[PDB]
Every structure is written in C-alpha cells, then in structure tokens.
C-alpha cells in the first residue's frame, strides 16, 4: 500500500523583518587595509540576523548572515580595552559571545564562548530577555523576567575568558526593564524595576544593584518603592559637574521622574501632551529612552507611545544651589521605535518596532534650554504643556529608510506564475507587491510594425568610439535596420528582402549578415554607407539552416550535407574558407559557439533527432553525445568570466530548458541541469550585467526566464514583464546599467532595465520628510470571478472610520469621477470583511462592524471610464463579532462566536438561510475554509480544527472528525479533500489528515445518514464513544501528518498548483512578523532520503566539529562552533511539538555557504554521492520546485 506520509520541504524565501535587537559595535574591517571606526550596526530578528554599515551617511547591507535556528532574546555589543564583537543571548540559555569574521570570500559569524544557563526553551527562569553590558565592557549581565539574575565578569586575554557567573535570586520579584549605568571603572551598577509576583496589592519598586569587583558579588543598594504605574529606567551618566552617586530616569505613564541612588533628589517633570488627543487617549508612557553626551552637553531622547521624541538636559539652578534640574522639550518626533542608537557621527539610528528602521543626522538639535515657553522644568513639578505636533520635520532629517514589513496582517497571491505577493504597508499605508520575478523597468518604448521574430544589437562600425550602435530586427519576409544614439533613435543596402538567420561583428569595423539564401560581408564606408566586400552562396543553392559566430570566427550550417567554417584574416579584413567536409552525418539542427573571445574551442552542434554533439576546434572531433527528449529548439554556448566554466545552455522544444557543465580539454557533457518553463518552443539570448560584472541568458517563452549564475549558484527566474519576444543588452548615454533593448510578443519594441535579482538572501523585490498614514490597514480581498482584482480595506486610529481601495492591473483605480483613488466610510469599522458574488453578474462587499452589524455593499468597475463605485445596500444586525466568513455556494458562509450561520440574499436586508450549532467544545471561530463547497474546516481560539460537511435537504453542516490535541489556529486552508493546513498563534505550522477509516465511510456513504440514519462504525469507534465521549464525540480523529515550527505567526496560507510553472504544487505562507515560506511536497522517496540525510548531517555538524577538535586535542573551537548557538536543529524546530514528516530545507541551505574543507569534511559520513552532487540536490529546490 502507498504510504501517504506527505513530505514537506520548508523554505524561508524572505526572512523575518521585525528587528528586535541592535548593537553599535565595529565588527569587521572590510575594503580598507587599516581602519578603525565605531560607525556600524548589527541588527537581529530572532533567527534572522543582519549587519549594516553607514560611513557614507547612507545605510548599507554588509552581509546577511546564516540562519542561527534559535530565538535571539537579546543582543548587545561589548567593547573591551580591539575588534568589537557582540554578546548574544538566545534560547538554550547559552550566553554566546560571537565575533563577525571574514573567512574565505565571505563574512561568517564565529562564536567564541557559549555558557550554558537554564535549559533550552523560552522561560521566565531563563536568564534572558533582559541583558546589558557594562559600557566599559568589563562585565555582561543577564537577568530573568522573574526568578534570578546572573552577571559574568568578562576578561580578555590571548583567548577570551568569561568569569564564573555571579548569582542573585529573588523568588517573588518579577524583573522588568534592565538598565545599566555607566561608571568610571569605580564599580559596575545596574538598575531594575521589580514588580512583586505574590502580593495583595500591586507594587512596582525600583531597585539598584552595585556589583562589587572587590567582593565579587552583586549588592542590593537602594530599594525605592514607586507607584505601580512605573514603566522604564534609563541611566544618567555622571552629573559630575552638578550635585559615586548614579541618577536614573524612571519613565512613568503621564509624567517622568528621576531618582538619586541615595534618594536625596527625586525630580518629577510632567510629560507634555498633544493638542488633538484623538479619541481614545491613554496616559501614554515613554517606550524608549537613550542618552548622548558631547562637549559637557549631555541630552537624552525619550519617545512616547504616540512617537513624540523628547530630550532632557540638566541645569544646576545656579540661583538656589548646584543641584540637578530636568528639562523636557519637543523634537521632530518619529513613528514608534523599539530602540535608538547614535553613532560617534551625528547619525541617529531609529529602529522602529512598527515597520521600518531609518537613520538620521540631526542639525537643529532642538530648542535651547533658555526658552521658558516650550520647555518644562523641575522648578514646579505640577504643570502641563500642550503642543501641536510638527510634520514640517525641522530638527531631524531622514537619510536612509529600510523597507520592511514587521506587521503584515493579510495578503493575497497575485500573478500566481511569478509568485507575486500583494500586501499592505502598515504605517505608510501603500500597496506593496513583493515579487519573485526580476524587477524590470520599462522606458521609452516604441511601436514596431507587426509580425517580428528576432533581434540583435551590434556596435556601429561606421562611427568609431561613438555612441551610435546598430539595432537589427527581423521579419519572416523582411529585415529592418535601425540606428541608435543617445536620445536619438533613427531608421535607415544590406538585405531587406530575406530573413536574417544571424548577424555579428568581426574583428574591428566589420560586420557579416547571414541570411537563409546567401551571406553578406559588410564593412563600414563613410557615415551612413556600407559595402559588401564578398558574398557567399551555396554551390547549387540551398537554404542555410543555422549560423553561429565568435568575435573573429564564424560557422554556418546549410541544409544537410556540410558545415562551413570561416575566420577573419589578421592585420586586415577578409574571410577565408577551409577545404574539408564536416558532413556531421545528419542534418544539423542549430549551432552554438562562444562569441565572447576571438577564438572559441568546442563548437556545439545540435541534431533534429534530439541529440547534441561536441566539435573539437586534431581539429574537429565528436567527443560526446546527448540524447535528450524533443528536438532542440535553440541553444547557446557561454563561458563565464569568474570561474571560467564553459556552460552550454540548451533550450528545447515544448518549453524544457537545460544547462550543461562543459569541460574545456575533454569537452565532456556533465552536470545536467534542467527545468520546465511554460509551454512553447523556447528562445535564448545572451546578456551581461552586474547585479561585480555578471552574465545571464534570457529565455523567451509563454513566460520570460533569465538564467543567471551567482557565485557557485544559479537560478532561473521569471521576469516582471509578462512576455518578451527577443532580448539583447543595451547601453545609452542616459544612464544605463543592466539596461536592455527588447520586444514584447505583441511585436512592439521596448527598452527596459532589470534591477534586483532573486538571490538566496533576498529572493524578492519590494514594489511599494516623514510619512505616516492615520489609516492602519485591516484585511485584503480579491474577487473570485476576476482572476486577480485586489480590494483593500483599512481602518482609522481614532473615531471609527474605514477606507476601501481597489486595485486591478497596474495601479489602483479612481473613485467615480472624483480625484481620490480610495473611498472613505464614516462610522464604519471593520472587524472582518469578505467580498461575495450572489449572482454571476453582480458583486457585493461584506463588512462586519464592531457595532455588531453586517453591512452589504456593491462594487462597480467603470471600464474605460474605469473606476470603482461602491454602493451601500442593506443593514443587518449580528449577534457575534463574526471573526470569520467566506464564500459558500451562492451564499455567505459566516461563523458566529458559537455557531455557523449561512446567509442567503434577501432584499432590504440579508436572510439566514441555515444555522448550524457547533459542538460544545468550540467557543469561537478564528478562521475557517471550504473544500469545493462540500466540506469545511472550522478553527477555534482555544481548541483545534473540526471538519464539517454540508448536507443538502438536511440544510446543516455535520462534523465528521475532531482534532487530536488543543491547537490555537490563526489561519487554515485545504490542500485536498482529506487534509488541512493550519498555523498557530504560537508559531506551529501543521497539516492534518482524516484517517482512511473515515475516508472509506464518507466515500461510501451519503452525508445525510451521518446525523441520523444507519452508518455502521467498527466496534472500536463506538466503544470510544461511550468510553471517551469528550474526545471522540466527533467519532474520528486527525492523525498528525505534518508538523513544523516557524517562530513567526503565519497570517496567510495559499496553495498554488504551480510556482512559476513548477510541477510540484507548493503552499506558501506569509507570517505576521513578516516572512514568506513554502512547503514543497517531495515526489518519490530518495528525494526525502537524500534531503533527510543532509539535514541529519548539518544537524549535529557542530558536534562533529567538536569531536574532531576533541580528538586532535587528545593527540595534542567550542561546541556551538558551526551552529553559533547552542540550539540543536531537531530541538529548535521541534519545540512545541516534534516535527513529523517535515524536513527543514532552511538548514540544508546553510551547507552551501560552508567552505569546501568543511563541506567535504561533513559529507564523508555518507557512502552516498559527493559534495558536488549534494549542492546539486540542495540548489535543485529553488530552481525546479519554484
């Protein structure tokens, strides 16, 4: 019997974008022989990690480091009296101090010491989640949210040394907001806010700790009880000029305090407030404080929940005495930012927990302390200042922004073939389509006469050292010639009466045009004139099959018998022909040779029978043979510059594309790399780009596939444009890099520019003063009938309000005849929304208000007046909030809190057609989905999925299966009839399947007999009904099929029958914290056997390195060396529940980056294929499976 056992291949296509941690240190010295500068930053999101530099005033990707496979719960850089390397704490409790190093040709992250603490999980006892380092780098401190605090004393030597941990344990005191005070080397002092866990009243009390380097323990110093309203602590550096006595800034909600260590000085300064105070107004708070000091002037920046950015300076109050004062003022503010840094340069990096991280340079620096108007003082602690925010943005100037989606709420999958993902932007509220396809610009296109075929571009020999370049087009009957100059595109002898098989430049200032019947040898004469010095014709006449060429070299193949070899004479311009017969023994199909060099060995010949031969250019010999499928449609030979590999790119008829490693000396055919793209005979062309210079081959089909090879990797890709008939690299004085001249399949010339390429790190491009939209997006919708038309729905933060913005095709739509591209709905807020078509010709929209009211709308497309017109129809009161609804046949299928109502279409309001009462277990329905209108899968907050079946004439959904365990399901879909996808609030990605015992029953029986009537259940099921009525109430159970843990929270699953024409249908998910990843079902077995073995290798690979490094120490690198963190793979990915059949490819991908020594060291554990074939199978997934 065939084992179902779905084998899913997880990939992270785009890596988690919500940046939770940062560090200011200078890690690597790159591109400079000797340089030391403190300006650089490394930022971490849980697993994912990135390293940015500025140094230009504009932020720069340095390298995206390998996936750590853990949850980084804090990261802080340490600077010791040297290269500054960051201390990193995560799950496993391990304190892992890592240095970013340059190894081989890339930057890899090396670990120095990892210290075991607590256990492996995210815990309250776990001394993580609160971490800071002595600003002089003498000691690192970790703490726990509740139980205990540990502080290591860090020392540097020939090898780094971490001192034994210093423990303090307070059982009932829940710790929050660790903030360490800088010191002069006196003694390290850290400050916390301890809230008592077990108490009758809520008591939040600050506590000071001075670690004593002399006595080597942490000492409780001052315990100050403050109001329960407390928020956070910041460290005031010295106050050495005013009057060891550290001073802290305690942010409360509606006011700020600062407190002395000795309690002598407690200063209350009330935080100012906005003028509008829109709708709901909290007492607010300050989320993030930071400190800066220069030229005796130290100011701190503290930002409120509204994003208001404030400063504090200290004044002596010379009149009274020398004593500290506290002065608030107002700045440019910003959006809410989790953490703030400042370079030694005037650049202030704002890391926003909301969406985007952006960097500043401050000039105005803010208002002077002299003004009493807008500045508040500690003179009178009771006072209030109202201020209107300033969008003019005087103080701070945005230099660089980083496009990221931290809160991606929903998305729809648009343009299934190029995997394009349509999702909102949270703050800016712009439409973001992030795409797998290559980003392709289009500029100054021009309409060509109909029925065009191929294209070429050759430098104009007539004008030497000039921008003029000749562009050649082809029609079957006619040939068109065109002249290129900057901004000047003009039209022009040669042969216009016959199709052009080939044309190329020879040597210097010469051209040859090969056409079906005869050749032409053309040379430039004067400016607009050219002259053929010789012409070639078959002896008895013949139709030339194909032609290829090199720089100085040429080949043409006629109908059948012989092939013709040409060269150009050196020191002059001439053509010669050899006397010889290369009979080729068959009819030559197409010819290929390297045109990159003046002399190209190893011609590539194709045969109509479907075989490919090599020709040694002693002289000619056939060293290899390929029998491949259908006849070759087109083929190109290209040797890359970097590695010098000569690759033969062989396109085939019916749309199969192929690629071959070609040995230079032997000419053997090895390393077959195939693909299937579209249905059409493919076309190929060669282009050269950068992103270091680079070369790719464009492939023309139903789609357009750029095949490019990055370093030791290559990825075929679809391009953003729908189709391209013929493509060749182009250059213009108008700035052109990656620039290309091509033609659409419509027979229209166009110029374009490719920009971003889907590398392993990116795999996407994101198509989108300070800009913040008041409307925060809600959901995203798409019409069933229109294949892709995407409707967006947002909300207002304030008085309840909504907007609806519909887009189809390129950009949005107008609303009616109005200028506005969106619609505003007053007093309507959307808890959940879905669009429905009750009749095939009518389209309605569905809103569920927080007022518990069901609102119906009508969508209109104006069509060449084209605009969206929304129309309010009905009003219906609802009992529940309606968290989930969807399209059932002809009807709205909605879920109340308890029960599932199926509404029909009534007039003046919509009607309840049927109601289904849930089993007692289900409290609420988060999300639900249908299978072909027959079946449903209904999710819960607390409990798990339960599948229903619609019974006609019973007018009810009957639950036929329960779920095994309790799982909190955010989003849920169907792969099939019998299986279900689901995610968790906590990050589990699982897939369940109904048991075959149930599938036989439902396949062999009608649903009407389930609720009442005769259905014969095996003896065990009933005994489970009377024995365990609570679990088996639904009389079946989901056997766990696939389970996985992705640390994000999955927002949207989508099951795509094909990803960029790939055969294996994938399921792609976007997470909330932002991510998109896929689960690819693996066909056959040895796919998942080889993948499983590679994952098993990379799993303990760090341990294998540790045991080798151990044995060599027995005959004469820590344990977490290769993983950089203590977490095992199976442990991290297992976590909540063990992964079942899912093998994680995100691990096996890390095998690609390791050096050849390490890789060959790992693969020796297998009797199976060599490292090269390993990398083959690894890279096979992105190419072939999507």
């Amino acid at each position: 019997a065939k084992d179902d056992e779905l084998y899913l291949y997880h990939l992270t296509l785009k890596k988690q974008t919500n940046f939770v941690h940062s560090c200011i240190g200078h890690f690597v010295d790159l591109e400079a022989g000797s340089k030391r500068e403190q300006s650089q930053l490394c930022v971490a999101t849980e697993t994912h990690l990135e390293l940015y530099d500025t140094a230009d005033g504009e932020l720069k990707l340095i390298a995206k480091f390998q996936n750590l496979f853990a949850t980084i719960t804090s990261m802080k850089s340490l600077d010791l009296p040297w290269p500054t390397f960051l201390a990193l704490t995560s799950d496993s409790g391990n304190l892992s101090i890592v240095q970013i190093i340059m190894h081989a040709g890339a930057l890899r992250l090396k670990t120095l010491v990892n210290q075991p603490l607590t256990r492996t999980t995210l815990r309250r006892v776990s001394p993580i989640s609160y971490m800071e380092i002595d600003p002089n780098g003498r000691c690192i401190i970790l703490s726990s949210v509740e139980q205990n605090k540990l502080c290591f004393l860090v020392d540097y030597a020939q090898k780094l040394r971490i001192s034994s941990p210093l423990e303090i344990i307070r059982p009932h005191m829940v710790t929050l907001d660790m903030a360490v005070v800088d010191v002069n080397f006196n003694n390290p002092c850290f400050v916390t806010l301890e809230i008592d866990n077990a108490a009758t009243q809520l008591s939040v009390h600050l506590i000071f700790y001075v670690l004593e380097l002399g006595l080597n323990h942490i000492v409780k110093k001052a315990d100050y009880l403050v109001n329960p309203s407390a928020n956070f602590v910041l460290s005031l550096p010295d106050l050495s000029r005013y009057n060891f006595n550290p001073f802290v800034v305690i942010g409360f909600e509606n006011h700020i305090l600062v407190k002395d260590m000795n309690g002598f000085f407690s200063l209350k300064v009330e935080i100012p407030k906005r003028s509008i105070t829109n709708s709901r107004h909290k007492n607010v708070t300050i989320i993030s404080g930071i400190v800066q000091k220069l030229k005796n002037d130290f100011f701190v920046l503290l930002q409120s929940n509204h994003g208001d950015l404030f400063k504090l300076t200290v004044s002596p109050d010379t009149n009274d005495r020398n004593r500290p004062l506290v002065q608030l003022s107002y700045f440019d503010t910003i959006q809410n930012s989790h953490q703030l840094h400042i370079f030694k340069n005037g650049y202030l990096f704002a890391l926003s927990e909301m969406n985007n991280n952006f960097l500043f340079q401050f000039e105005k620096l803010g208002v002077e302390k002299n003004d009493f108007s807008n500045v508040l003082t500690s003179k009178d602690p009771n006072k209030s200042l109202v201020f209107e925010p300033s969008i003019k943005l005087q103080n701070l100037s945005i230099l660089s922004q980083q496009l990221n989606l931290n809160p991606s709420i929903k998305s729809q999958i648009v343009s299934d073939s190029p995997l394009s993902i349509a999702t909102k932007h949270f703050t800016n509220n712009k439409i973001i389509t992030l795409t797998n396809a290559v980003n392709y610009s289009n500029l100054i296109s021009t309409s060509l006469p109909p029925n065009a075929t191929k294209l070429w571009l050759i430098p104009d020999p007539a004008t030497t050292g000039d921008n003029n370049t000749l562009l050649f087009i082809t029609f079957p009957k006619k040939t068109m010639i065109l002249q290129i100059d900057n901004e000047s595109m003009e039209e022009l002898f040669k042969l216009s009466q016959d199709t052009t098989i080939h044309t190329c430049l020879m040597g210097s200032h010469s051209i040859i045009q090969v056409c079906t019947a005869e050749l032409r040898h053309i040379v430039p004469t004067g400016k607009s004139r050219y002259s053929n010095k010789l012409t070639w014709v078959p002896p008895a006449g013949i139709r030339i099959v194909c032609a290829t060429s090199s720089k100085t070299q040429l080949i043409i193949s006629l109908s059948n018998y012989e092939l013709v070899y040409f060269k150009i004479d050196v020191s002059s311009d001439s053509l010669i022909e050899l006397t010889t017969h290369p009979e080729l023994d068959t009819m030559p199909s197409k010819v290929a040779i390297v045109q990159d060099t003046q002399h190209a060995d190893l011609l590539a010949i194709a045969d109509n029978e479907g075989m490919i031969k090599i020709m040694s250019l002693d002289f000619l010999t056939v060293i290899s043979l390929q029998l491949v499928s259908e006849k070759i449609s087109d083929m190109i030979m290209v040797r890359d510059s970097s590695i010098g590999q000569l690759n033969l790119h062989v396109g085939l008829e019916n749309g199969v594309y192929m690629k071959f490693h070609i040995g230079d000396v032997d000419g053997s055919f090895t390393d077959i790399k195939r693909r299937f793209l579209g249905l059409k005979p493919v076309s190929l062309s060669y282009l050269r780009e950068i992103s270091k210079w680079m070369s790719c081959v464009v492939c023309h089909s139903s789609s357009t596939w750029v095949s490019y090879t990055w370093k030791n990797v290559w990825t075929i890709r679809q391009l953003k444009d729908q189709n391209m008939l013929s493509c060749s690299k182009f250059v213009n004085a108008d700035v052109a890099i990656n620039g290309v001249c091509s033609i659409s399949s419509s027979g229209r010339l166009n110029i374009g520019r490719v920009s971003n390429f889907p590398t392993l790190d990116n795999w996407f491009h994101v198509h989108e003063m300070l800009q913040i939209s008041t409307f925060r997006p809600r959901t995203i919708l798409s019409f069933p009938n229109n294949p892709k038309s995407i409707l967006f729905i947002d909300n207002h933060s304030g008085k309840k309000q909504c907007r609806i913005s519909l887009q189809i095709d390129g950009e949005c739509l107008k609303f009616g005849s109005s200028d506005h591209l969106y619609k505003i709905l007053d007093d309507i807020d959307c808890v959940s929304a879905a669009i429905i078509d009750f009749t095939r010709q009518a389209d309605h929209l569905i809103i569920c208000a927080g007022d518990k009211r069901l609102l119906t709308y009508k969508i209109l497309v104006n069509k060449d007046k084209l605009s969206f017109d929304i129309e309010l129809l009905h009003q219906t009161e609802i009992i529940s909030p309606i968290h989930a609804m969807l399209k059932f046949k002809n009807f709205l299928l909605t879920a109340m809190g308890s029960t599932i109502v199926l509404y029909g279409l009534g007039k003046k309001q919509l009607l309840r057609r049927s109601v289904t009462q849930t089993p007692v277990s289900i409290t609420k329905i988060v999300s639900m989905h249908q299978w072909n209108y027959e079946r449903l899968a209904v999710g819960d907050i607390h409990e798990s999925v339960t599948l229903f079946i619609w019974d006609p004439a019973g007018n009810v959904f009957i639950p036929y299966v329960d779920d095994s365990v309790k799982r909190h399901v955010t989003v849920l879909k169907f792969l099939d009839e019998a299986t279900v996808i689901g995610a968790d609030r906590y990050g589990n990605a699982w897939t369940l399947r109904s048991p075959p015992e149930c599938e036989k029953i439902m396949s062999n029986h009608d649903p009407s007999e389930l609720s009442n009537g005769a259905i014969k259940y095996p003896l065990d099921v009933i005994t489970l009904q009377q024995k365990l009525p609570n679990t088996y109430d639904c009389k079946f159970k989901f056997q766990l099929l696939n389970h996985f843990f992705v640390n994000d929270i999955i927002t949207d699953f989508h099951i795509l029958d094909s990803l960029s024409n790939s055969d294996r249908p994938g399921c792609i998910y976007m997470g909330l914290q932002g991510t998109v990843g896929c689960f690819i079902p693996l066909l056959s077995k040895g796919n998942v056997f080889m993948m499983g073995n590679i994952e098993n290798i990379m799993a303990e690979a760090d341990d294998t390195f540790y045991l080798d490094y151990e044995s060599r120490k027995k005959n004469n690198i820590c344990e977490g060396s290769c993983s950089i963190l203590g977490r095992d793979h199976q442990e991290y990915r297992s976590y909540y529940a063990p992964v079942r059949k899912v093998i994680d490819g995100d691990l096996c991908e890390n095998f690609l980056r390791l050096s050849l020594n390490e890789q060959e060291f790992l693969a020796k554990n297998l009797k199976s294929v060599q490292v090269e074939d390993i990398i083959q199978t690894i890279n096979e997934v992105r190419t072939n499976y999507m």
Binding site: G904, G906, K907, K908, Q909, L910, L911, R912, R913, S914, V915
Partner: peptide, 27 residues
C-alpha cells in the same frame, strides 16, 4: 431537555421557513 425565508414584500426577511410555507399553501 431562526431561519428567514424572504417573503415577496421584502419584509419577510424576518419571516420563518414554515410560516412562508404556510403562505405558500395560502398563496
């Protein structure tokens, strides 16, 4: 130990299934 069958005056969106069947027998 609430279904709505939509009468023709468009006020029957509150009207029960069996009630509208009774008005089928009446109609």
């Amino acid at each position: 130990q609430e279904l709505e069958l939509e009468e023709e005056d468009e006020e029957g969106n509150v009207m029960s299934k069996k009630v509208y069947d009774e008005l089928k027998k009446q109609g």
